[PDB]
DNA sequence: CATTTAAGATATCTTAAATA
DNA sequence: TATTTAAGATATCTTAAATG
């Protein structure tokens, strides 16, 4: 029952940096990685790649896990 | 430059599918697929990796091209 | 001080109508 | 009849305020 939020925060914590630091390697807010860790949103096309590139896995290990 | 829209047309023309055929591949409305051809609006991040599997082709050639 | 919550603008979809 | 346009619901972002 892992959602993609869950997936996002663990590879972030893996890098021991802050959200706002994601923010500025993908290009949104700190506020945008908050919302897609809670689940409440989810990342949009380009976002989801640069996210998936600055977390160093695949977009579809986010979106489905593995 | 060329657009992404641009690429995912052309993409569709080479597998011969309509619009509504891509969409129920991916599991959006021929209108959504409509829209991503002429650049009206991006995929999201599940439908944009669902688009990228039903062309054959990775999201980031759809993204950024080559 | 890092993160979440709040308020708000634009983006992304769906269905019905319009167009080629 | 394939695709585009129009309207409208709601998702995805933004910066400021509040909270831990």
Tied chains: 1, 2.
Excluded: F, H
């Amino acid at each position: 029952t892992q959602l993609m939020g869950e997936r996002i925060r663990a590879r972030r914590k893996k890098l021991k940096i802050r959200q706002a630091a994601l923010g500025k390697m993908v290009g949104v807010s700190n506020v945008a990685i908050s919302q897609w860790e809670r689940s409440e949103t989810e990342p949009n096309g380009e976002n989801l790649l640069a996210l998936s590139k600055a977390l160093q896995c695949s977009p579809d290990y986010l979106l489905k896990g593995d």
